[PDB]
Amino acid sequence: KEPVRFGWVKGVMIRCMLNIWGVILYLRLPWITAQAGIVLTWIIILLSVTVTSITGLSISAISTNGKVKSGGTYFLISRSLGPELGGSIGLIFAFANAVGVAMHTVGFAATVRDLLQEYGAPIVDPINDIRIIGVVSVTVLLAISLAGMEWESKAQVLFFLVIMVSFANYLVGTLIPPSEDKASKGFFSYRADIFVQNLVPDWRGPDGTFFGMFSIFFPSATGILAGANISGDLKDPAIAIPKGTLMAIFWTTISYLAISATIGSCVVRDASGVLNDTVTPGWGACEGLACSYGWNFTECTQQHSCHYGLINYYQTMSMVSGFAPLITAGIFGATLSSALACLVSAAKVFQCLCEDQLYPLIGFFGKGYGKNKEPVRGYLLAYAIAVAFIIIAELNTIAPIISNFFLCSYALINFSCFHASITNSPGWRPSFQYYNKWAALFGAIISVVIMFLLTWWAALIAIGVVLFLLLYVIYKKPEVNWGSSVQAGSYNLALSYSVGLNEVEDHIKNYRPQCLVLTGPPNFRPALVDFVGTFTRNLSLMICGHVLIGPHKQRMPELQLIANGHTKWLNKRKIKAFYSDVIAEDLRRGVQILMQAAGLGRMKPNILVVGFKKNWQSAHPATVEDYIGILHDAFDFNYGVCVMRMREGLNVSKEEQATTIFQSEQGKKTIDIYWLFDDGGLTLLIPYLLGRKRRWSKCKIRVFVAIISLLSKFRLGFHEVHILPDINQNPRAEHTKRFEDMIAPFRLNDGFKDEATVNEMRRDCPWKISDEEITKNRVKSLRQVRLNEIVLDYSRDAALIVITLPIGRKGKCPSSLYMAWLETLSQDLRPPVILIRGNQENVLTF
Amino acid sequence: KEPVRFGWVKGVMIRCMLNIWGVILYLRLPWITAQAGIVLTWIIILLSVTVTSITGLSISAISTNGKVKSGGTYFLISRSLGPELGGSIGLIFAFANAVGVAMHTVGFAATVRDLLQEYGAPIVDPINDIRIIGVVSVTVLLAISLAGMEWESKAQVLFFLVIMVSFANYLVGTLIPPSEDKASKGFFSYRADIFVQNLVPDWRGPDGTFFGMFSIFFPSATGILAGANISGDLKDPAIAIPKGTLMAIFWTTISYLAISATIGSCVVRDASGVLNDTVTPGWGACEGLACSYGWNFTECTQQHSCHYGLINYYQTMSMVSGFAPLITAGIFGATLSSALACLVSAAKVFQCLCEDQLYPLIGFFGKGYGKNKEPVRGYLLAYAIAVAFIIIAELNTIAPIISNFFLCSYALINFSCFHASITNSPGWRPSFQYYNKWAALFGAIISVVIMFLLTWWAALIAIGVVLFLLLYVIYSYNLALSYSVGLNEVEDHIKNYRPQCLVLTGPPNFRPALVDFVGTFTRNLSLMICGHVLIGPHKQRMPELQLIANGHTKWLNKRKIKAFYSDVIAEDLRRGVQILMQAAGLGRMKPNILVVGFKKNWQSAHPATVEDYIGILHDAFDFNYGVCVMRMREGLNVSKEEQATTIFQSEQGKKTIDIYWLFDDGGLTLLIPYLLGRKRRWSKCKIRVFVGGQINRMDQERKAIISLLSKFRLGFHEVHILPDINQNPRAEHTKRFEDMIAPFRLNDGFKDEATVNEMRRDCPWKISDEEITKNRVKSLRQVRLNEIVLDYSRDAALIVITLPIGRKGKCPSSLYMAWLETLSQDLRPPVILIRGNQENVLTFYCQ
Amino acid sequence: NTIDAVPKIDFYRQTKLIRPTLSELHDEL
């Protein structure tokens, strides 16, 4: 009580050979041999079999790299190039299959109609004959297909046996001495001179050109994917697909090469068909090899006006054989087997395509009925399409379009083997080793050259329909993640250039601002991701750091899920940033890890962007110590610092994503800069790079500072320049008392004692301030509140204010004093405020 | 010395007008009007300026979006579709211009030569006159263009005045009553019965069909990018480029529409040209229309063999003029202007490509060229190509592929606007009143349709040569940064797993063996990062430290190894390795395997070093790493010109790679040898795989293992089974293990776990005997497996055993190191101990 | 569970037992 699975002979080889053998073998191959001669016909066959051999090797390498399921061709292409190029070629493969059902039932019906005219009486109408017969035949084929998959595989064997019987009949017939009405039509039994004179071309008519023969034959050698299309019923598709496909191609090619060279050595190109053309002694003259055998076709050859022979009579292969009705049976089998093999493939590819939710509302047809889960709804859709194209019944101009839907699949079956083999993902491990990627690119190019040679305006329609669906799938972005080779091309494309960076040494004319941004969870502080992603996009590096403060010291898998959530959040905003997190016991010791290790060779951060600690006056005085220690560590590691503040705050935690200030047009406002120390040029570069952006390009960069000589020489292009007024002068008293009573809870009331005893008493906590430093660094303390007054005077209603970050000497001043300066310097201002100081490096050399 | 800037009426509108106007205006348009009639010619003109106006709208939309430089056209295709279409289309667009220079100077050359045949005496054959004069004309244009673009604007203004006097001459000559000589050739003044006679087509000839007329005219209406390629020389492009480009189109279309009607309202289609055809009163009956004016043109119209008239004489508009030579002056202006516009617009694009750093294929630019940065090298390249194609002198065969190199650019320029509009690309917000993404998609459909309609095989070479350039470049800082950030979208699959190593070398030149080994199989495949921990105080970027860190990168580069160097500072090795594990890498390119060397003399150094060494592995297992430990017989540290040579630089030959797959770790034990065997040195080796099994299930599970190894497509040759691992080892080997573990033995008698910590805090590496009893079976397994390995793999090339794993708090460091040293002792080839992280790295399936 | 497993086919299939995790083999008991 298990579903049946097929071997390789009965499952791949028989079906591929039945699909390849059509009606060209019977009704137009002798004609091609007569027109083009044996040698050039052999060239045509061996030239049309090169393309299908190359595609067989490609589809055979692709299908032995894992386990294959239902879906056949579509499954193999989509899982190897992804849904964009896989779901656009799996919707026209099925449609082309359905129309192929239509165009082979039409041929079967035409043969039946031609049989019925002569023997008895034709029915209803010449053209309304090919409608009735085709519709009834497709209904019968639908029934036999819909009855199960062990009954169709019993019909295909019957058709194969019928074809073999026709071949044996023809070979037996071509070996008996010719009867009198048999030789009057051209057929002499076997010789040498007919062979010799049939070796060279004899073109006639408007259709008799070499390319006019290649155009007729080539679409009759494709059809090799009829066994790979039932890959869900084979019991070992990793051994059944290569052997079956390649053996089928070999055997059908031998069949063609034998039929042509055997028909061309028996029947002469010109014969009359009248039993009275026997040669009369002593009269006139011969016109050819015929008169040596006693027959006289001179009037034909002189007038070019008779019906029989290897050119003029299309059904010569019926006349030659011992019993023509068996050749008729062969034609019936050859035409019905292809229709059945197309009807099955359309449904089994469409069901797989509908399982994967790639297109809006065709998912109704991806349902299985029964134990084997046959697509009882795909069969009926293909039947409806085939009956619709059979009612038309004149498909002589539809065929060029359909035959180019099958050459877009040959061009993507071959590119999928080239692309996946030049990449070498570990895991790209096929067990069919007899292929080459350059011979697979060759086939991809030729399948597109031929598609235009055959007819240039149907290739245009085919490629237009391919791109329409390709673009739809790109713009909808479904989520599948099948691990294609396009996804593995990105990694080694990135690695090849990251390793390439090493070759170029460190210079001074390639400075870039590469930022390490201390965000925490990017959700919490978006106003600090936007500011940095404004001026580093498409120019330099930015990393969004994060320290997980806990004592766990183990990297649980759940942390990688969280790091995938934050990366996706960054990707929604279209920020070009990297996320990285570490684990430490406090915040100061995680940023040390990030500064020391992060980056890749030459692409490593050299600027530290950190928010401002708003609540430093109501937190434990040991956290401000860590906060100032971070800045001191950044200075020791030879970084540049940028402390950023806002009036309302940075942490937003204390659906849609949040919107901040740095996302909107800020036209007609000024960007104020207060240059107080030659840091090298970082205080000037950040607003210079910020103002070039469109959102900030309508702003007036104002610089408040020999200086004009130093400014214009770097061609920065700033609007104004000024001299700040008298920073030395004493500020008014109320602000000064505010400064002194702000720093009061760090007072010590120590009077004056020797440094030894002072340190003996400070040993517990270093953040407390003694009166010695207070009275020793009171001047520059006043200077900060004075300059805050100045800034609050000029920059009251600006759009972005940049000042210079002071440095407090280690050991000579505590951290509380430095944080008090940093506070009072930028308080009670409305716009965003930044405080930059570089690392004494020439950065304006660009 | 401020750079010169141009307005909209002299740097865009005039400069596009001159490029649109060619020689079809003077030699072919009257013929089109004669054949297709007035109405259908108007249809052709409007139907072919629809496309150019749509592309003008897209270019105008691009111009009002930020600021771009001169030659920065491809820069949207580059931004919106990747920098391999951007650069490729830019290269194609510049080459097409360079060829257009030659194809216009040849028209000027032909005009001058045919003028020479009439008046004076030609001095050479009529095919080397074209060559001998085209080169001189192009050289003169190169001189007056290399002079500076101030001396090119003046020439383009002179050329405009010349055309405007040719129009004045032609328009004056059609209001004057027809002279006896002129009227014999078919010229009559404005009369209504000629207007109504020419309103309908009169097709004749091989290419006298509507498609033939469209195919002659349409490539005479393009050239609307002549002023948009110099966006770096305009005063304010966002206001000058739309207003100028969209009025050049309008006024040239007006001129084309006016000439056709005015010329068709004057001249009959057929005429004789001999003054004998004055009518004879009373001589039968007339035939034709001119017989109402005094002229009989019957004999031609019956025999169809005269030479003049609007249908047979191409120069019919040079005779209706008041003075003939002014029309040839118009010809000279019309050809030399387009030749100059193309020469400037190709130099701009070449110089922009040579300045582009996301397209490092062209480059070729060294020292700066010119005080004003004139694109001197771009000019020389364009001049070279133009001369090379002049020397050919036959170009009607090359015309229909150079004319599709432009419609490829039109199609992609139009499609990138639609793409960037519909994907809501950040940085594309064009502030232009009349831009529609649908109207820009239509202009990209139509451009390709026309491209393939004009001639299909030439449109296939044009697409084919773009894809060769696209594929050739797929197979510095701004390119590495743009691809690394592109990995943030592609999401990981087990089918694409890559082993990304973090190699602990030290100074890379102390341990060449590790570097060579790990650079064998990660080469062109995955990441590897050399590591180095400078044990000591903390401080950084000392001028010396960076200069040291550059020397080791130079050493890695000389040896031809694709690796990164990374040094951190800590107080001991363990903390430095933790710092390196947690934070090294960039995004998805971060290590997930840690490879170290073997502690050669772990029995002589202080045991705290052994404790830290084993702690390194214990931490690697805590961060989800796979661990490889590499042991070599002589040692890895070479310290204890020329670069030293290791055994991993020689071809190994036909020797074997024995793998001992004991515990299932995911597949890393047997993915390293596979990748190792994809290389030249190891490509002849034989992979033998050993597994454990039972006596009386031997073949039944050998077959199962062989079936498993062939679902993975690994291609491993042998498979053996070891059924005697649970035996007892020989006596002296167990005695050696027990003596080699003696110094670390606690020797505490037998006490409970509560008090063992009491005397083991001082030395946490010591082994309590209650704890050495519970590990006797596993301890003897290592000796037995060592005997097996010596028995089999004595003469192999590389040996792989799985790493035993020890629980925290259940096995001390000394015991673990004793196992690691027992498993791989007294054995000649390199030994590697691998342990994956218990996750699958191999797969059967496709999804 | 907690004991290291010799190679089997059952760990690599899809649909019966689970390969021990790295934390199960390494963390304390």
Ligand SMILES: Nc1ncnc2c1ncn2[C@@H]1O[C@H](COP(=O)(O)OP(=O)(O)OP(=O)(O)O)[C@@H](O)[C@H]1O
């Ligand atoms: N866990 C963390 N990881 C990384 N960076 C952090 C972390 N915590 C804080 N920072 C950085 O240090 C800055 C100052 O820390 P602090 O906790 O004072 O900010 P905050 O109090 O969250 O800001 P707000 O006043 O807006 O709440 C933060 O703005 C942030 O830039």
Ligand SMILES: Nc1ncnc2c1ncn2[C@@H]1O[C@H](COP(=O)(O)OP(=O)(O)OP(=O)(O)O)[C@@H](O)[C@H]1O
């Ligand atoms: N300063 C260092 N930085 C980075 N890695 C190191 C450093 N020192 C040692 N290692 C790595 O740790 C391993 C431990 O070996 P250790 O240095 O303790 O003894 P060794 O005999 O010097 O090592 P080897 O056998 O490699 O010479 C070494 O093999 C090496 O790979």
Ligand SMILES: CN1[C@@H](CSCC(F)(F)F)Nc2cc(Cl)c(S(N)(=O)=O)cc2S1(=O)=O
């Ligand atoms: C003869 N066929 C040609 C198309 S040219 C004849 C024309 F269509 F024009 F009539 N190519 C294929 C290819 C495949 Cl792959 C399959 S199938 N069943 O494997 O999927 C079937 C066919 S075919 O039978 O339609």
Ligand SMILES: CN1[C@@H](CSCC(F)(F)F)Nc2cc(Cl)c(S(N)(=O)=O)cc2S1(=O)=O
């Ligand atoms: C008259 N030209 C036609 C091509 S007609 C066929 C041919 F002559 F090429 F054989 N198309 C363009 C388009 C542009 Cl956009 C530019 S330009 N100056 O912007 O670069 C120049 C030209 S043209 O001068 O070559």
